[PDB]
Specification:
- This is part of a larger assembly, with two copies of chain A and one copy of chain C (about 375 residues).
- By secondary structure, chain A is mostly beta strands.
- Chain A is built from one helix and four strands; from the N terminus they run βαβββ.
- Chain C is an alpha+beta fold and about 375 residues long.
- The longest helix of chain C has 27 residues.
- The chains are: A mainly beta (about 100), C alpha+beta (about 375).
- Chains in contact: A-B, A-C, B-C.
């Protein structure tokens, strides 16, 4: 019954390759991604207002569903829980680091 | 090409970072599938 | 009755051949067919030309100096030699080949009604219907690709003494079952075809009870073949199957990998397809191998064990630019809008999904396969 006690949270949103390339330093493994496999219609879990027949021709401007994981993990195995963030598309982990916000 | 996906649902360490213990994609997906049944039941009431 | 409001849902079956294939774009307004050029080397048998002159100076039938043959006799006979006052002695020519592919259509739909969905005892029926629709579509696409790959195999080897699908049998002196020598032969052929090695060897770790693996290729097998692979023994009588636990540490285990044998790393595919009834007729002396009944007669079953090399094929993609296909899904919530010859009121909706499929094979020589029968 309290948000602060929650271990983790997961949000699924739509992004394009341009958004990922805005900060190329942060992300990794952008090459080995199946952009078409993770299309909005191919993922019925995500609920959105985009019409079911819509795909921009430009590869950079196509929008695909991505997941994030904001939670606590024992990074060092010493028994301490520290905040982390993780992002994955399809079956590939593209970003992994600690919580950036203060 | 380059064979198939090199890890069983990225089990073990993908080695993105230098941490001694790394999360791997399987654990995260497993927590997601664990949590999903309750959220699906809850969204029916909102609908 | 007190409904628990939490239904039981199955998960989507994982797909292996969708992420493997590479996809080529294909603009519209421009046909449905893609073509390529192959440039054959100078010293090849496929280089059949007519511009040939030998060291003597007369016209010779074969322009290529000598074919793929590696005899000392042929090489010595057809060496390009040059005299002091050389001129118009040796000529060579070249050739190019073309390959093509095409695109085909697909699709299916379903129906429902306002009353059935709306006034149902369980809410959330529409989301479930959409879920099974998408899962069925993905599974169908996967099966079609796998069927095409098995059909278009270039190097086909028959286990045992058989020479075709029909003569494969499980009764007699030589049952048609995979053995160590067949795996060695397939490795030799794939090395001859200059097929690149997918994986790297594994050097052991420092922990106790750890074995080294020197396999460089990946093999896809069904579930029915794995016990037969496990029982198999090498030339000297020891066990050939080395399970993943031995070399798991200090190595990378691919998903769905049961173990490693010889040069190959065996990957288990749940959805692998098998020919039914292709074998010879099965009598009462059957030692326990799987059979299927066709036209009143028992017949044995044939199992693929496919191997797919790097850059063997590309999938023609119509407006995809990426792995897998693009599905077009349409939904119309029911109402009075629909009209018909005798059904102008309308209370039914639907949801239809369609896609365009095509494949192009660039180097069939790299695809390989071993046909065999599988124990029950």
């Amino acid at each position: 019954g309290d948000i602060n006690k929650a271990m983790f949270a997961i949000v699924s949103f739509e992004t394009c390759k341009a958004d990922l390339l805005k900060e190329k330093d942060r992300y990794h493994n952008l090459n080995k991604i199946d952009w078409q496999s993770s299309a909005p219609v191919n993922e019925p879990d995500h609920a959105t207002t985009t019409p079911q027949e819509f795909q921009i021709s430009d590869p950079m401007r196509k929008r695909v569903v991505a997941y994030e994981y904001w939670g606590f993990w024992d990074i060092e195995g010493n028994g301490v829980l520290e905040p982390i963030v993780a992002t994955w598309i399809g079956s590939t982990l593209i970003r992994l680091e600690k919580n950036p916000y203060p | 090409t380059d064979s198939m996906v090199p890890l069983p649902d990225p089990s073990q360490a993908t080695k993105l970072t230098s941490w001694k213990n790394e999360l791997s994609l399987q654990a995260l997906k497993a927590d997601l599938d664990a949590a999903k049944p309750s959220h699906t039941a809850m969204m029916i009431k909102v609908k | 009755f007190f409904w628990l409001k939490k239904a039981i849902i199955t998960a989507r079956k994982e797909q292996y051949f969708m992420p493997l294939a590479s996809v080529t774009n294909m603009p519209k307004h421009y046909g449905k067919t893609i073509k390529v050029y192959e440039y054959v080397p100078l010293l090849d048998d496929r280089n059949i030309n007519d511009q040939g002159i030998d060291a003597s100076g007369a016209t010779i039938v074969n322009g290529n100096l000598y074919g793929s043959s590696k005899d000392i006799g042929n090489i010595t006979s057809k060496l390009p030699l040059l005299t002091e006052n050389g001129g118009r002695v040796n000529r060579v020519g070249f050739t190019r080949i073309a390959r093509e592919g095409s695109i085909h259509k697909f699709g299916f739909f379903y129906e429902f009604t306002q009353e059935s969905i709306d006034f149902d005892s369980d809410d959330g029926l529409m989301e479930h219907l959409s879920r099974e629709l998408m899962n069925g579509a993905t599974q169908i696409t996967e099966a079609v690709l796998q069927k095409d790959l098995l059909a278009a195999a270039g190097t086909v080897l028959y286990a045992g003494a058989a020479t075709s699908d029909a003569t494969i049998t499980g009764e007699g002196s030589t049952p048609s079952v995979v053995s160590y020598k067949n795996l060695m032969r397939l490795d030799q052929i794939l090395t001859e075809n200059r097929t690149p090695t997918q994986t790297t060897i594994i050097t052991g770790s420092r922990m106790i009870d750890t074995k080294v693996i020197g396999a460089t290729r990946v093999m896809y097998v069904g579930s029915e073949l794995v016990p037969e692979l496990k029982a198999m023994k090498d030339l000297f009588g020891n066990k050939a199957f080395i399970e993943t636990q031995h070399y798991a540490d200090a190595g990378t285990i691919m998903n769905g990998e049961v173990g490693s044998i010889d040069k190959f790393r065996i990957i288990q595919v749940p959805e692998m397809l098998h020919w039914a009834g292709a074998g010879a007729q099965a009598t009462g002396a059957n030692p326990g191998y799987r059979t299927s009944m066709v036209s009143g007669q028992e017949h044995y079953d044939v199992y693929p064990m496919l191997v797919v090399g790097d850059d063997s094929f590309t999938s023609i993609g119509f407006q995809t630019d990426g792995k897998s296909l693009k599905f077009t899904v349409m939904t119309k919530m029911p109402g009075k809008e629909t009209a018909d010859r005798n059904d102008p009121y309308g209370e039914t909706g639907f949801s239809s999904i369609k896609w365009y499929y095509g494949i192009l094979v660039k180097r069939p020589e790299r695809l390989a396969l071993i046909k065999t029968v599988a124990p029950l």
